[PDB]
Write an enzyme that holds these catalytic residues in place. Structure first.
Site: not given
Length: 322
Positions: A72-73, A176, A229, A282
Site C-alpha cells: 500500500n501507500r 493483493h 477500499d 489483502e
C-alpha cells in the site's frame, strides 16, 4: 499424491503444482504471482486470471496473488528510520504516494521444490541487493523467500524476510490476492471490529473508528452496492479468536478460508466499483504508511530486522466443500 509440472502461461514459464484437491500455478517472472488456484473436485477457478499477458502487465496487482513489499501507500514516497531519510518512487501521481512496493513486477528465482506425503512445496526467492533501481531507493540487503505448500485442501503461503546486510531495516508485507467474487451470489466475512480513518490520499489520519456493520461483517454479508477500499484492523490483537477473511460461493457451496498469523494486523478490502466481478481481501503485516506513524508497533505492525535476522510471516487459503 501430488505433482509439479513445468508449463507456459500466456507465453511465460510457470510452475503448476498440486494434489487431488487443489492445483496452483505460480509465475516466477511475474513477481512470483500465484496466478491460478483451482479447486479440483468442483473444478472451479478461485483467482481472477488475466485475459492476456499485456493486460497483466497493465495491472499486475489485480490478478492472482501479487506480493506487496511493502504494501500500500507511503506518503510522498518518503519516511525516516532511525535518523535516516528514504525516498521511494512516487508511482501513484494523483495522490503523491509510493504504492505497493518493490516486488510484484520483478523476476523471482525458483530456489527449490520438494514433494512427500506431507504435500508439495515450491519456493521462490528474490534478493533486493541484485536490483540496482530498488537499491537506489532502499539500500539494504533484504531477501524475500516464498514457501508455497499444498497439503490436503490448503495452500500455505509463507514469506521469510532476511537481512543479509550490515544495517537494520523496517519491513512489512501484504498480498493483493484477487478472488473471483460474483456480486449477486457470494458472501464475505472478516475478523475486524475497527478500521483506520483515511484522508483523501488514502493515508491513515491515525484514528480508528468502529465498523457499524461489524456483526454482518463477522457473519458473512453480501457486497452489492458497496464499494470498498478500506483498511480494517484485525480484531485478533484485541479479542483473540481467528484472523481471517472468508468468501462463500453460494452455487457450488465452496468456502474459501484465508487465514493469516498474528503479524498480519490489518486487512485492506478492495472491490473497485463492485461491478468488476472480483474481491481483494489483502492481509498486511503493517498498516498503510506505517513508516510515518508515531504509534506503537503492536498497533501499526511495523517490524524491524537487525543484520543477520529473519522472520517468517504465515498465511494460508483453505478450500472447504460444504
Amino acid at each position: 499424491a501430488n505433482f509439479i509440472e513445468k508449463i507456459t502461461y500466456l507465453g511465460t514459464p510457470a510452475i503448476k503444482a498440486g494434489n487431488e484437491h487443489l492445483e496452483m500455478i505460480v509465475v516466477p517472472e511475474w513477481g512470483s504471482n500465484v496466478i491460478s488456484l483451482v479447486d479440483k473436485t468442483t473444478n472451479v477457478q478461485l483467482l481472477r486470471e488475466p485475459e492476456t499477458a499485456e493486460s497483466f502487465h497493465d495491472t499486475p496487482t489485480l490478478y492472482g496473488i501479487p506480493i506487496l513489499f511493502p504494501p500500500n501507500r507511503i506518503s510522498d514516497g518518503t519516511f525516516s528510520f532511525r535518523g535516516r531519510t528514504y525516498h521511494f518512487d512516487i508511482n501513484e501521481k494523483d495522490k503523491h504516494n509510493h504504492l505497493h512496493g518493490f516486488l510484484y513486477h520483478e523476476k523471482w528465482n525458483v530456489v527449490t521444490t520438494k514433494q512427500t506425503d506431507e504435500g508439495v512445496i515450491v519456493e521462490t526467492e528474490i534478493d533486493l541487493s541484485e536490483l540496482p533501481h530498488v537499491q537506489k531507493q532502499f539500500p539494504h540487503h533484504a531477501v524475500v523467500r516464498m514457501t508455497y505448500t499444498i497439503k490436503e485442501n490448503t495452500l500455505f503461503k509463507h514469506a521469510t524476510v532476511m537481512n543479509k546486510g550490515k544495517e537494520a531495516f523496517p519491513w512489512g508485507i501484504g498480498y493483493h490476492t484477487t478472488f473471483i467474487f460474483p456480486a449477486e451470489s457470494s458472501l464475505f466475512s472478516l475478523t475486524a471490529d475497527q478500521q483506520w480513518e483515511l484522508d483523501e490520499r488514502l493515508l491513515p489520519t491515525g484514528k480508528l473508528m468502529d465498523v457499524p456493520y461489524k456483526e454482518a461483517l463477522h457473519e458473512g454479508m453480501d457486497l452489492r452496492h458497496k464499494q470498498l477500499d478500506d483498511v480494517f484492523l484485525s480484531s485478533y490483537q484485541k479479542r483473540g479468536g481467528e484472523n481471517q477473511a472468508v468468501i462463500y460461493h453460494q452455487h457450488a457451496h465452496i468456502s474459501i478460508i484465508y487465514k493469516a498469523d498474528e503479524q498480519f494486523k490489518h486487512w485492506v478490502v478492495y472491490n473497485a466499483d463492485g461491478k468488476q466481478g472480483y474481491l481483494c481481501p489483502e492481509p498486511y503485516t503493517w498498516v498503510t504508511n506505517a513508516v510515518n506513524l508515531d504509534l506503537p508497533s503492536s498497533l501499526t505492525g511495523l517490524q524491524v530486522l537487525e543484520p543477520g535476522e529473519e522472520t517468517t510471516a504465515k498465511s494460508s487459503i483453505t478450500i472447504e466443500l460444504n
